[PDB]
């Protein structure tokens, strides 16, 4: 089935022959993500026929098949603008059950969410119309159903994925989920239920949890102010406890590193005072965080986003908790015997962290030097002894500690 | 890079289909195939692929980028006979003059204008300050007053430069690298009014080119700021529109940056003579320019003979009135670093990441030193990486 032929059936075709035409096109292209530029206008003609019936309203008989054709065509940049209109996005939202304006077919809901994810991911116009339509309201509510919902894993995952796409790409939707919709409390609950204290997280629960973490990162990375109230502090502390469980948890399918990374990144957004839960001697979490960072020091092109969050978290734990500061000091900066080998030479942890003090990125320099500085209890000669003056000079200068 | 062919790169918002018609006529007479392409990030893609010896035979862009291209040895010297140079306006020949040498053929003068919906807004406003009141009145019918691209500093710059902001000061018959007017009182006042429109919810910080165009062309917003290339899509739509002078900020005219669309010849091209015959004897004629202008309007074309056929167009008259009240863009190699800094400053000020004074202060330092603060904070990298991990289903 070619695009021109399928488009011909939709125009001049009986009900049973237009469904087979789409049925065959969906079979041949269920995994089509590259498209031939020759039949480009054929696909755009077919896409405009699919949108006309979608905007009019599909009968329940031909709904899963019609949306699958739209989902396939939405993978093409050329057919994209045909699907990104208000009526079209309103029809997909209504079929997904997330429209603000009939029972739901779970296969229709699944296909509508996938269609919406593709258009929102690919089209700023679609992102703008999705913000205007307020899809985030019903999305967060259904996500907030929690144990009260028999919705399948697929529907729950694509709600979160659509929640991630809207909050990552649209700052107005991002702030709406944070402020008006109280998304932090909503997604902390959804995280708590996705986790259950199993020693292994199943593959399905691993996917939804990490989406929840990435949505939580979008709404917390630049919206939480320095001074919070006790409701927010208790909310963030509770959320931090779930992140402590993720750090200590293993994930099926060799995804334990991927889950830990998102948990650490979200930790880096919480108010610093709320990191005390990582300690409630008992350094199991810090030990895991320390080796998490130690394994990330091999990243070169993506070093910044790999080590800065965990170093910032370790630095704050050491700064506010004396047993953590001393434990990390014993692990990172063990007492020197021979003081001849330069600090910036070697493969030990202290050597890797000193070399970052003269990194090219100013964020890496400050974050690495601040870490070793607080492990030295902010003592200038102790800081110089362990890191060497030339490496220490950057921090000491920035803090006005030369005089 | 193939010989016997002509590969042409032009931006995606221009009449690339119209330019393909001129290539068809070129193949009809000479038998030489012409391929027109509109790659994304065209102004960045060309330096990276031409410096290695690839890229198109002919490169189309506004004149401001051609100095940096010529400074890097990427452009070949053009040799138009004095008989050909007289068919085009001298002021457009000035825009492609780098170190007293002609590096590109000028095509058409561009400038932003205020496009408005005659049905929603029969009397367009003359000042920026009345737009908040106008958007209030228009929100009562489910509409808004103004939407335009807030992701490119080119569209914000008219409001920025109105009260005194500028790029590089022109003095002693030359642009000096170190005199930059990005963080003066005027540029701070213009960018602040822009940011205040967004805080008061008359404009959205996430609005790009396609979002603004979609809203105006579907009758949702009463006004948009765009150039001559955008008139065709508004013609095709159901919108009855007019093109008028930009509003006045603080009683002073908005000063858009005037660009001259230009066609440069690649230094690595083995078809530098076919490129000359295509641009002189086919494109820069009445037939060649009409074919492109019919697709997407060019503005005021550099060719005298065809600009006469278009001058009475009230949209061209409004384009020139805005062009007269603006500034011809510099083409110095520092322009590339200038736009990079102001793009970051507009986005950061609009999104509320920095204040007006912070964003413009950092942009001044980077633009004064021809440097690029390729920073990106950690939280921004994580979001962009989580987004990049998302594929299609
Ligand atoms: O936004 C900075 C950008 O401004 C100009 O680009 C214009 C171009 O001149 C127009 O013809 C049209 O394509 O819109 C563009 C803005 O998106 C400069 O020419 C360009 O160098 C600069 O980056």
Residue numbers in the entry:
A (entry chain B): 1 to 101, 107 to 201, 208 to 291, 304 to 426
B (entry chain M): 3 to 395
From the paper:
Notable among these are the resistance to inhibitors of cholinesterase 8 (Ric8) proteins, which regulate G-protein biology in species ranging from slime molds to vertebrates and, in contrast to GPCRs, act on monomeric Gα subunits. The interaction of Ric8 with GDP-bound Gα stimulates release of GDP, leading to the formation of a stable intermediate complex of Ric8 and nucleotide-free Gα. Although the GEF activity of Ric8A and Ric8B was initially thought to account for the ability of these proteins to positively regulate G-protein signaling, mounting evidence suggests that the Ric8 proteins can also serve as ubiquitous chaperones for Gα-subunits. To gain mechanistic insights into the function of Ric8 and its interaction with Gα, we solve the crystal structures of both apo Ric8A and Ric8A in complex with the C-terminal fragment of transducin-α (Gαt) attached to a maltose-binding protein (MBP) tag.
However, the use of bovine Ric8A1–492 with an N-terminal His6-tag led to well-diffracting crystals of the protein in complex with MBP-Gαt327–350. Residues at positions 1–426 of Ric8A other than those in the flexible loops (102–106, 202–207, and 292–303) could be modeled clearly based on the electron density. The crystal structure of the Ric8A1–492/MBP-Gαt327–350 complex revealed an interface that buries 956 Å2 of surface area (total buried area divided by 2). Residues Gαt333–350 contact the concave surface of Ric8A from R2 to R8. Residues Gαt335–346 form an α-helix that rests over a neutral surface of Ric8A, whereas Gαt347–350 is in an extended conformation and lies over a positively charged surface. The C terminal carboxylate group of Gαt F350 forms a hydrogen bond and polar interactions with the side-chain amide of N123, as well as the guanidino groups of R71 and R75 of Ric8A. Furthermore, the side-chain of F350 is involved in the T-shaped π–π stacking interaction with F163 of Ric8A, which is held in place by the T-shaped π–π stacking interaction with the neighboring F162. Another hydrogen bond is formed between the side chains of Gαt N343 and Ric8A H273. For instance, I339 and I340 of Gαt occupy a hydrophobic patch formed by F228 and F232 of Ric8A. Thus, mutational analysis validated the Gαt binding site on Ric8A identified in our crystal structure.
